[PDB]
Amino acid sequence: SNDCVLDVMHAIYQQNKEHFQDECTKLLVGNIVITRYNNRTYRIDDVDWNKTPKDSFTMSDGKEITFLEYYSKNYGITVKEEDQPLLIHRPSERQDNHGMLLKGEILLLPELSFMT
């Protein structure tokens, strides 16, 4: 059926990629992980596929820093896979304020998380 091949390989791609992501979340969301570099423990609520260790976050005074730097400075850890998604853990009284959010959101790297 007349149509650019790449464009077809793009549609097909999406349909598959999406099934892949929906399969990791359906397997991770709900379970408990251990950040081994600090013996802590969190329960995954979501996976953020649109973020990556190259992205940055904003500390208290506004200063921004990429997850890559944050981990080598605070933990002396060199993140290998700079293309992994971020694991999301949400606290217990996060939204509350009818609309606006309170507590932020905890972001872990799959590379440093281990299952149980």
Added chain:
Amino acid sequence: SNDCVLDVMHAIYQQNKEHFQDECTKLLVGNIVITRYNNRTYRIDDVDWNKTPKDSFTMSDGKEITFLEYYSKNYGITVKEEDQPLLIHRPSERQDNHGMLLKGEILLLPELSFMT
């Protein structure tokens, strides 16, 4: 089950990616495409997922050139998607020489190929 999360997301990834590729070939291999930039027509025998327009090929005297340059110089075409696979078309009397190959192999970009 105790195991690094990323490593799990890697296995799961493969199993999916592979299904994706096996789905494009199972849909392209056998069909006829039209390189619109020259009204030619070929029958896809394979898709080479391990190659990309950034790879190069060797002309008659050995001189190497990337598909990206080859297309802007010979056709004045600027390839957008530098991450697409290469479509493979094999001729009719290619191997012959009990072992060694004769005629090479024709490589088309999905971005420039259209189906029928």
